[PDB]
Design a protein around this ligand. Structure first.
Ligand SMILES: [Zn+2]
Lengths: 128, 154, 78, 204, 99, 60
RNA sequence: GAAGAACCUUACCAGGUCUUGACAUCCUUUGACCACUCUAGAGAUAGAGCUUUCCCUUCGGGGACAAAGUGACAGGUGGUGCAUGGUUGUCGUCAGCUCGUGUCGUGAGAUGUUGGGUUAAGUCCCGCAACGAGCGCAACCCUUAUUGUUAGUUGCCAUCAUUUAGUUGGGCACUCUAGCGAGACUGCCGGUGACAAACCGGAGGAAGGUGGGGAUGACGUCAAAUCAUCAUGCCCCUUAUGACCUGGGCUACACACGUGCUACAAUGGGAAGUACAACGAGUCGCUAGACCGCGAGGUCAUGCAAAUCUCUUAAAGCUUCUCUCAGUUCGGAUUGCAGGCUGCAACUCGCCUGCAUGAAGCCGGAAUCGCUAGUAAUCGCGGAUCAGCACGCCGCGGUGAA
């Protein structure tokens, strides 16, 4: 059969995006945005690559993402979305470049140092 | 800090209500970065506005910014080296900053029992010349033009 | 895990068994920390060693809930 | 004191471990055995003045290998030294063992032996100035680029401490592709504890 | 089938060159071998203070790197059995046969 | 003093909770690895020796 | 410092004993021994049972002693950091410090290292009798920031079969693991700027101007600190500054102070039901699965020498009634009863469950510290020695501003 390649990668969370041209299905491991994700399940945050270019369809998606809290494995979806819309055209990709949501924000937790208690939290220092 | 003017570090728009001063107030009320409980009390506060004597939520915030608005700014700073305080104009980002700050100041400690009684009623109250945003507006209108002329060179 | 009642260690337990068959003497120079008390010892006297000196102190009529080392303190606050 | 060994900063990077092993669940016994045999190396070091001793492991053959300039001072001549060391080391080990002896290459360059020699002159009342200056003379005759060499403590067999040291050429520490040699010796005839420290440069 | 080996050593050179040697003695006399599939390189850390008498407030850390491989051989020939039973060096990679 | 104490671990234990650990080359009972049979600072210097297989300084 | 104190880890206090001694190169029969059991104890042990028992013989030898006892002793955890090493804290990633040669001053020396702009940067140019060089910054080490080859088990399922389920056929199509790669280098353009570096701005680029972090502590200042890691100068005990055995001890309190953990409540308070991480560890230990069990507690047993099985479904999440600001449906300092666990036993001096229990505290004066972003701020898990033991430490993993 037909299936379209896609994967995401951000913040300890990897995705398996699998597009078919359809109407809009979003169930990660057969669990919907209102089944998996709780009440903060913003559609425009998720479907903003649809919501700012080729709005919207939608198109049916077999999706398999896992790892970490809800926002982290929500931010790791847009790479496979850009791959799938890229398999449509790179013509929309210049608009994606001008609208962003493509440059992966690498901001993870900064590494701690052995010698303190957090990455930057010092001692509650006295007078001396 | 010392070297030059620091980069601005702006904000993000809402998906639903589609605003950023709203979003900056969302961040100003948010404690421990816990969004979802704060999100529910945000939508509940906008729904207490919208139904109870409410036309529109953009309109009630515009009616706030009519009556909220920080207009002046006293500044206790020396250059010559003494107890010098200058009233100066308020920066526009600092104007929104002080406005949302006054909102959280009086919606935080109004004194009503349930947690968003005081929140939702004060974001009703700031729209129509009530709340301590108006009290601090009186403070701004009063203590300015008074301690000016000694620190007039600022 | 000492829920099974009596607990007096052996080369003190044979001494106190010999005390049960005889008349009640006083001094035993020992650990005095480990052997617990249980009602077949009513009226006796066994020396409790604080760390300084053994305290030959009589075993009472209603002691079951602790051991020898409550008579002589381990700090001697003064 | 704040400096760090470049031989510790570059170990396992351009050089290799002594105990070339992988010892799952039977690990520290053999390394304390390595300590035991390391206590025993005074007999070979008496004549031959070795620098490095490298040890591996077969099934039972404890593969050890030394490095010095004089084989006849450590082989005997036909096995007189070698079998006596086999017996005295078998009494330490109780197992198969094989010594290995390799000729050194420019014993002038050996930074353990240079510090050993200047400490040897410090054993018998020789002035430190001419000693470390002829050390940099023979280091120039060894052929190098820049040499630092420091001594510290009760110099001249005397009172409270001094610490000065000679330097020539060019020698950085910030470079990672350096492979600079280093050795801390003693400096002790009858007074406490002192030592010498060496910092040569040769290029990568 | 009835021969598959784990290969434990430290760094990049030993595992892959010894794996090349043993797979070349394997499919030199025979066939039926996969690749030396890498493994996630077990690691656990260490901690030592920076003083000799005092100063808990300054530590120093250490690590371990030990890469691992995996080679399968499915129903071999008796001549790579000859290559197995005699070639048992070096001991950096572990001499190790299992199921 | 400590030679009797080094000999104490070589003598068999009187019961279960008398078995303690110390280093081999020194005898420090604090901060002694049961995997290395070393104390802390002697492991430190032997790591600067690089005679311990494996362990190196780390930085990431 | 002490990364785990019931003796033990204890350096201290009380008792009992030896002081060639428990700890060192010889002295006896070499012994074959220590060994295992008996009276006793608190035991050093005294006595015993027991022999505890000869490990080549070329006519011998020595390869092996347990007290036994002798001198060289031997044992020091006793001190001098102001005899010390080595090692470590600090200014501080501050931005400096010298050398050769040429020159000015009689000289001691000065010059380079200098005036502009420019920077994390004594970075770089333009001027300048200096020319340059070396030690310095940086790079060369690691991790993350995208991805090619190489390969598929337990990673992972693609067309599909299996089917509760990647379960077993098949496979590397997502991910994954690790060798080498490629890539980011003011690299390009435009402008400001003497055209100097630098800056501003944009394209392109996953990443732009040291991409975000860790390694890296120059000369020197502080007789800083350490003789208790180690061992030495010097002094000293050396029938004890040497020891074995029984208990206490560092944890008792007339007070002051530091670092922390939790409450002072309706971003709650409780009830119910609905999910996702990573680093490790685990073969005599993680416990697979089964139950009783308010619970400390047990129950028969499988896998797991490790991408297989566990700890570990992470919590912090949702969605439904409740209490209407109350020392309280917040809170548990608090001491007795019933149990249980590691140890062998837990008053001394461990941990846990139920019962009694709601005390203070309703946001902390003078005062100060830390912080320019996954940061502060909040919540779970892993781990170091560990008979048992953390509000400790070292991480990881989520939510997320000014
Ligand atoms: Zn050690």
């Amino acid at each position: 059969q037909v299936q379209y390649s896609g994967t995401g990668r951000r913040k300890n969370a990897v995705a398996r995006v699998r597009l078919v041209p359809g109407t809009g299905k979003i169930t990660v491991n057969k669990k919907d945005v209102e089944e998996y994700i709780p009440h903060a399940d913003l559609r425009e945050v998720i479907n903003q690559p649809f919501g700012v270019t080729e709005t919207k369809g939608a198109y049916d998606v077999i999706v398999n993402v896992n790892g970490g809290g809800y926002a982290g494995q929500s931010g790791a979806i847009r790479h496979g979305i850009a791959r799938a819309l890229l398999q449509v055209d790179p013509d929309f990709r210049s608009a994606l470049k001008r609208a962003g949501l493509l440059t992966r924000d690498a901001r993870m937790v900064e590494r701690k140092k052995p010698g303190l208690k957090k990455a930057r939290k010092a001692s509650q220092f006295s007078k001396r | 800090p010392r070297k030059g003017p620091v980069a601005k570090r702006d904000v993000l728009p809402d998906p639903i209500y589609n605003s950023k001063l709203v979003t900056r107030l969302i961040n100003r009320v948010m404690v421990d970065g816990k969004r979802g409980i704060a999100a529910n009390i945000i939508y509940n506060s906008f729904d207490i506005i919208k139904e109870s004597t409410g036309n529109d939520p953009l309109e009630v915030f515009e009616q706030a910014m009519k009556n909220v608005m920080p207009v002046l700014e006293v500044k206790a700073r020396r250059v010559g080296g003494s107890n010098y305080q200058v009233p100066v104009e308020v920066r526009p980002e600092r104007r929104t900053t002080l406005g949302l700050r006054w909102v959280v100041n009086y919606a935080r400690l109004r004194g009503e029992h349930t947690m968003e009684e005081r929140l939702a009623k004060e974001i009703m109250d700031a729209a129509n010349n009530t709340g301590a945003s108006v009290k601090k507006r009186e403070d701004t209108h009063k203590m300015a033009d008074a301690n000016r002329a000694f620190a007039h060179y600022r | 895990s000492l829920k099974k009642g009596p607990f007096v260690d052996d080369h003190l337990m044979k001494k106190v068994e010999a005390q049960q068959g005889a008349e009640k003497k006083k001094v035993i120079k020992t650990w005095s920390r480990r052997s617990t008390i249980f009602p077949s010892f009513v009226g006796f006297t066994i020396a409790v060693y604080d760390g300084r000196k053994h305290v030959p102190v009589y075993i009472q009529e209603d002691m079951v809930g602790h051991k020898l080392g409550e008579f002589a303190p381990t700090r001697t606050y003064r | 004191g704040q400096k760090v060994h470049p031989i510790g900063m570059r170990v396992g990077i351009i050089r290799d471990w002594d105990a070339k092993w992988y010892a799952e669940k039977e690990y520290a016994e053999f390394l304390h055995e390595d300590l035991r045999i390391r206590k025993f190396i005074a007999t070979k070091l008496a004549d031959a003045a070795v620098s490095t001793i490298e040890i591996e492991r077969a099934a039972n053959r404890v593969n050890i290998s030394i490095h010095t300039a004089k084989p006849g001072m450590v082989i005997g001549k036909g096995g007189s030294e070698v079998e006596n060391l086999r017996k005295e080391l078998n009494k330490l080990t109780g197992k198969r063992v094989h010594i290995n002896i390799v000729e050194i290459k420019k014993p002038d360059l050996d930074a353990k032996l240079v510090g050993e020699g200047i400490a040897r002159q410090l054993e018998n009342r020789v002035a430190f100035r001419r000693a470390q200056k002829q050390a940099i003379q023979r280091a120039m005759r060894a052929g190098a680029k820049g040499i630092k060499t420091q001594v510290s403590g009760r110099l001249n067999g005397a009172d409270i401490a001094r610490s000065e040291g000679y330097s020539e050429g060019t020698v950085p520490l910030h470079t990672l592709r350096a492979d600079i040699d280093y050795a801390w010796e003693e400096a002790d005839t009858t007074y406490g504890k002192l030592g010498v420290k060496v910092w040569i440069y040769r290029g990568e | 089938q009835k021969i598959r080996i784990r290969l434990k050593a430290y760094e990049h050179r030993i595992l892959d060159q010894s794996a090349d040697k043993i797979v070349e003695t394997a499919k030199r006399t025979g066939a039926d071998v996969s690749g030396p599939i890498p493994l996630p390189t077990e690691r656990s850390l260490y901690t030592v203070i920076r003083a000799t008498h005092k100063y808990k407030d300054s530590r120093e850390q250490f690590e371990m790197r030990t890469h691992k491989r995996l080679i399968d051989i499915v129903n071999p020939t008796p001549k790579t059995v000859d290559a197995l039973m005699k070639l048992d060096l070096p001991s950096g990679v572990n001499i190790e046969i299992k199921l | 003093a400590k030679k009797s104490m080094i000999a104490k671990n070589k003598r068999p234990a009187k019961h279960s909770t008398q078995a303690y650990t110390r280093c081999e080359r020194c005898g420090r009972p604090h901060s002694v690895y049961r995997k290395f049979h070393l104390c802390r600072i002697c492991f430190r210097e032997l790591a600067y020796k690089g005679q311990i297989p494996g362990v190196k300084k780390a930085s990431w």
